[PDB]
Design a binder for this molecule. Structure first.
Ligand SMILES: Nc1ncnc2c1ncn2[C@@H]1O[C@H](COP(=O)(O)OP(=O)(O)O)[C@@H](O)[C@H]1O
Lengths: 380, 53, 152
């Protein structure tokens, strides 16, 4: 309390203090700039139909109003004003005041990641081969962009990840967007199909629109199965809307007019329901699989997972890994944390072999009926 | 000629209007880019031929 | 540090000696950082009259006060308490500039920290001259030690 006593009074000093000069000094950062830019201006945005020559007079449709063929700002050349360019229009005077850039809607920007998911290549044990190629599709071309010219070639401009549910594909997205640097666009096909007809087409564009103005960006599509994979067809025209959306993605994803530095990452569990047009190379080159860890792998998965907790140092995860034939690296995680309960269920700090053994037999086995890793292996 | 024409024409504000009926009883109605129909009895600067819906 | 084995820091005090521009300058630098923990009245008694001499482009004593601020840090030096009270108040030699105002002001601000009733004359060179460095620091002599609070 004496220290605590000193704490209170000390704080009260400033409290007492702050009030003092407060009385003394009794807007301009802005009220200037506000009033400064109050004599400034507004300008209704405009959509240019097109300009004309032997003189200028640019021709334009604003928006809620209509078309006005109108003069342009003196401060903008007759070039830096290409068609299809949302420009700003002296409101009253109705004359090009200044130019601008393009729309992208509030659905494409809402998915530009901003932050970054902490998932370094340390958590990605048991994939010395998976990440190995991935780094080629995404890492190396985006960073060291010399070699591929020193020898002149091109990298798997897009790459496919598949495997049952629980191999670590979303970590590789998270892994990449972590130690990547480029622009990682997280777009889920769940996002792609909406309500009104021909709406997804706008998304891919925006996607490819926004992918473009920003050289070297990773578009990633997890659950592409949602967007569109098969091209049925019959007397119902069901999965039609989505199909086009795929064709849209297809078209813009590698068909006439290059794409650019838009690298591509697709994540699926069923890499079997996917249109040849996606799969083909150009569009989707490097095809990478995510095995269900064997022996040495799981040991890395166990060691990685348990490496971050108070475990018994005698017990060797190798034994446990042995009792784990074909369980994804996710389940192996329910064990490592599973013991947590057991270890906590008594009152103990450190877990024992059996604690894991039970967990192994408690998770794996018990939660076997579910698993779904054997039904999703054949991609059903 | 040049004088007033520049004042009236010089007005770079231009509200494009899709012609509709070209009544020759030299009359002709038009609907504005503001979606407004105004029967102009003086097609003004613009030959008939130039005229059509 | 202090010197452990080879006392390169202390011998430096020999090389400091000169009331000239760059010599004093980095020696002031050297001896400021020399005499943090090696603190000595000499460098003062060297720089104090150089401070009384008050020439930044030659005597270099301007920044010296700051190096002097780097000498007895966190201690009550009644001398520097008085010494800059004897210089700054006196406005020794060239001072018109807010320079010899502030070189001496913050000179006191560093040395005193944590002496209680003994730190009162630090403001005398600091919050004396009205700047944004002035009416505030009036109570900053209070928080002359904490390292874990200030957001207020
Ligand atoms: N080899 C591995 N190394 C580290 N973590 C793994 C590994 N395999 C699976 N996991 C874990 O299991 C989860 C599986 O995620 P993911 O495979 O993306 O799910 P889905 O199959 O639904 O896309 C991940 O969160 C990851 O933490």
């Amino acid at each position: 309390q004496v220290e605590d006593d000193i704490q209170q009074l000390l704080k009260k000093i400033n409290e007492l203090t702050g009030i003092k000069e407060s009385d003394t000094g009794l807007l301009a950062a802005d009220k200037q700039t506000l009033q400064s830019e109050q004599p400034l201006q507004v300008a209704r945005c405009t959509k240019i139909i097109n300009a004309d020559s032997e003189d200028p007079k640019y021709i334009i449709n604003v928006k809620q109003f209509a078309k006005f063929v109108v003069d342009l700002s003196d401060q903008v050349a007759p070039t830096d004003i290409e068609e299809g360019m949302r420009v700003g229009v002296d409101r009253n005077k109705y004359q090009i005041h200044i130019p601008l850039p393009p729309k992208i809607d509030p659905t494409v920007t809402m998915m530009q990641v901003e932050e970054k998911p902490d998932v370094t290549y340390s958590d990605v044990g048991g994939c010395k081969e998976q990440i190995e190629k991935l780094r080629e599709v995404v890492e190396t071309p985006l960073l060291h962009p010399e070699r591929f010219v020193n020898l002149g070639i091109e990298p798997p401009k897009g790459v496919l990840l598949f495997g049952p549910p629980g191999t670590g594909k979303t970590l590789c997205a998270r892994a990449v967007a972590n130690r990547t640097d480029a622009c990682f666009i997280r777009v889920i096909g769940s996002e792609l199909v909406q309500k009104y007809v021909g709406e997804g087409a706008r998304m891919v564009r925006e996607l490819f629109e926004m992918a473009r103005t920003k050289k070297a960006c990773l578009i990633f599509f997890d659950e592409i199965d949602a967007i569109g994979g098969a091209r049925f067809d019959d007397g119902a025209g069901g999965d039609n809307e989505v199909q086009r959306t795929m064709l849209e993605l297809i078209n813009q994803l590698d068909g006439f007019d290059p794409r650019g530095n838009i690298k591509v990452l697709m994540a699926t569990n069923r890499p079997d329901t996917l249109d040849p047009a996606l799969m083909r190379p150009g569009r989707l080159d490097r095809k990478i699989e995510f095995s269900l860890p064997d022996l040495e792998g799981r040991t890395h998965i166990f060691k990685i997972h348990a490496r971050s907790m108070s475990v018994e140092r005698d017990i060797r995860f190798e034994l446990l890994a042995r009792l784990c034939p074909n369980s994804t690296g996710a389940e192996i995680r329910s064990v490592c944390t599973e013991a947590g309960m057991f270890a906590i269920r008594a009152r103990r700090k450190i877990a024992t072999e059996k604690d894991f053994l039970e967990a192994v037999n408690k998770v794996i086995k018990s939660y076997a009926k579910f698993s779904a890793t054997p039904r999703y292996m054949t991609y059903n | 000629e040049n004088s007033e024409k520049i004042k009236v024409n010089k007005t770079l504000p231009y509200l494009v209007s899709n012609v509709i009926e070209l009544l020759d009883v030299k009359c002709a109605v038009i609907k504005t880019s503001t979606r407004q129909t105004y029967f102009l009895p003086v097609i003004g600067l613009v030959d008939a031929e130039k005229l059509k819906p | 540090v202090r010197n452990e084995c080879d006392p390169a820091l202390a011998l430096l005090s020999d090389y400091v000696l000169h009331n000239s521009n760059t010599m004093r300058l980095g020696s002031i630098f050297g001896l400021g950082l020399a005499y943090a923990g090696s603190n000595r009245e000499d460098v003062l008694t060297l720089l104090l009259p150089v401070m009384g001499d008050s020439k930044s482009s030659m005597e270099v004593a301007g920044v010296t006060a700051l190096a002097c601020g780097m000498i007895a840090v966190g201690s009550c030096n009644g001398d520097v308490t008085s010494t800059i009270l004897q210089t700054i108040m006196e406005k020794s030699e060239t001072e018109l500039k807010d320079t010899y105002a502030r070189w001496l002001p913050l000179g006191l601000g560093l040395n005193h920290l944590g002496k209680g009733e003994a730190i009162e004359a630090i403001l005398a060179a600091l919050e004396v001259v009205s700047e944004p460095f002035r009416s505030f620091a009036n109570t900053l002599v209070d928080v002359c030690a904490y390292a874990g609070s200030g957001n207020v």
